[PDB]
């Protein structure tokens, strides 16, 4: 495992999802918005504490180089499971254990991704490795944990 141009591109896409005003930096406001779209309601202090742990130039916001350094790191995310479980619950709004096409579309829209019907259907198809037309938690985990 080494840093690749394809991974850098992928991380830039993820950075853009946070940097919704496209000014090149992630603020506390932007980080909190995304966290809310994914099932959490961080306090003001935790948002600034989170940014502080990677704000190398001390300007109080995260630029792409800082974000990249954080995403490329050899870590082993000890908080991974919790985050992925909360995210699953946001997708699975009716709590039936399966993410439907409507459910996926809803969350993607709130993340700023106005997916076409074809994209929604493709996303479900990619994840639905058991072929029952919907995405269960184990299937969701595979999509979330891919590197």
């Amino acid at each position: 495992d080494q840093l690749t141009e394809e991974q850098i591109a992928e991380f830039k896409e993820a950075f853009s999802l946070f940097d919704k005003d496209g000014d090149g930096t992630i603020t506390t406001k932007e980080l909190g918005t995304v966290m809310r779209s994914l099932g959490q309601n961080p306090t003001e202090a935790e948002l600034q504490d989170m940014i502080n742990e990677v704000d190398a130039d001390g300007n109080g916001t995260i630029d792409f180089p800082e974000f990249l350094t954080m995403m490329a790191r050899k870590m082993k995310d000890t908080d991974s499971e919790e985050e992925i479980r909360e995210a699953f619950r946001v997708f699975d709004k009716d709590g039936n254990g399966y993410i439907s096409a409507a459910e996926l579309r809803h969350v993607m829209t709130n993340l700023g991704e106005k997916l076409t019907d074809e994209e929604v259907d493709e996303m479900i198809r990619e994840a639905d490795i058991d072929g029952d037309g919907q995405v269960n938690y184990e299937e969701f985990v595979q999509m979330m944990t891919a590197k």
Binding site: F11, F18, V34, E53, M108, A146
Partner: peptide
């Protein structure tokens, strides 16, 4: 896997910022 990876990376970023 474009959109799933973006979503995954967003969750992973939040998890890593929270851990570090």
């Amino acid at each position: 896997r474009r959109k799933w990876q973006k979503t995954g990376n967003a969750v992973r970023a939040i998890g890593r910022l929270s851990s570090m």
